[PDB]
Amino acid sequence: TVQSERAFQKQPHITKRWYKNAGLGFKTPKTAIEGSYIDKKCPFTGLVSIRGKILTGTVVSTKMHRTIVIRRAYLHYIPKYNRYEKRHKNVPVHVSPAFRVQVGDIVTVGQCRPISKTVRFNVVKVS
């Protein structure tokens, strides 16, 4: 269940679960706003705020708990070679417990007061 540690967690919220509107054209899934997981580091119903940079990419690794690795890539144009060459740089982002995310699964990610030294972005929408 949700209670799996030595301390109870609940966000202070600056309805028992305060909905927060993201802006930038986004809306919660109904599983997130009527969930039971607390997860104050999740970008919705939490103290962290989503703003600024956005990017979309493909999930490449989902092996471990509450963060995932996104492969985003482009056929990068080397000017001297006159060649579009594919280059991927897999960045790790946080995943909220509102989206059952597997590999593949085109998603959108954005900066969330970056969490632990490489987690710079956070999922906001699946497709």
Binding site: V60, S61, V103
Partner: protein, 296 residues
């Protein structure tokens, strides 16, 4: 031209689907490859291994021999069937006679050299043809003729130029990153029948190209998991890299210093340097005190 172009597209994907299915044989073979390297190496070490569990080892070695010879015959049979259907082997009459014959181990040995030699002649024809095909199509023949001859070698020629050096690439496949020690390896080197373990010739860990192959697996499996799902993208491939190196052979307590370290800390050798006999008694009456305690 629309139907002729994309009928080949069915041929590409069915060759690519058949490409992924043979790596599933390559996935499921590794536990045999790992456990073969821990087998005894010499003739004498096999006999001492047969003494401990003599009746149990004899049925399994016969079961291993039956399962290997069954698997060896059908894999030659599939290689004959593949080269006939992909017009690699020009002699259909010889190849169709090999399929119906019950073959021993040495006849499967010699047919391996037959299928590899026919593949070798097919390879130098294909690799010279397609390297000419891409070089004429790219338009770089009229722009790169006089400056970069050492890099613009044909793909067949680029293969055999690395086949000048069997020596260095055979130093690659003895690299024992897995730290695998065979049975009675310590006895055989001490007896002279065969230490930096990082190069071990009797140990056969071909993991180096296999990790490249498993890197070639994850590159091809990602490109082939487009529609629904492929055979094995990362399941039992990265895990197969892990369990042979004991997932990481590391301890979290030894990392933080939460476990005791049996290593020399190089500044703290000799400031508090030892003393003379600092026991003011002669230490044998304290042995009587330790034997017969004044609390016990």
């Amino acid at each position: 031209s629309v139907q002729r172009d994309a009928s080949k597209g069915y041929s590409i994907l069915q060759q690519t689907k058949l490409f992924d299915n043979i790596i599933d044989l390559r996935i499921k073979l590794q536990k045999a490859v790992i456990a073969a390297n821990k087998l005894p190496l010499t003739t004498e070490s096999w006999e001492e291994a047969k003494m401990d569990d003599s009746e149990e080892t004899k049925r399994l070695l016969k079961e291993n021999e039956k399962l290997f010879n069954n698997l060896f015959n059908r894999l030659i049979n599939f290689r004959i069937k593949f080269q006939l259907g992909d017009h690699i082997t020009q002699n259909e009459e010889v190849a169709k006679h090999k399929l119906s014959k019950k073959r021993s181990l040495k006849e499967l040995y010699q047919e391996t050299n037959s299928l590899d030699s026919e593949l070798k002649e097919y390879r130098t024809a294909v690799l010279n043809k397609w390297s000419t095909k891409v070089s004429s199509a790219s338009g770089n023949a009229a722009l790169s003729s006089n400056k970069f001859k050492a890099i613009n070698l044909p793909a067949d020629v680029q293969v055999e130029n690395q086949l000048s050096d069997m020596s260095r690439l055979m130093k690659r496949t003895k690299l024992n990153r897995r730290n695998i020690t065979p049975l009675y390896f310590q006895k055989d080197c001490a007896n002279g029948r065969l230490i930096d373990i990082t190069e071990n010739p009797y140990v056969f860990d071909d993991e180096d190209f296999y990790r490249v192959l498993l890197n070639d697996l994850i590159d091809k499996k990602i490109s082939n998991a487009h529609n629904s799902e492929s055979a094995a993208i990362t399941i039992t491939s990265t895990n197969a890299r892990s369990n042979n190196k004991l997932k990481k052979n590391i301890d979290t307590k030894a990392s933080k210093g939460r476990k005791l370290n049996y290593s020399v800390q190089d500044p703290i050798a000799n400031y508090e340097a030892p003393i003379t006999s600092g026991y003011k008694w002669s230490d044998d009456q304290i042995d009587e005190f330790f034997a017969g305690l004044l609390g016990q």
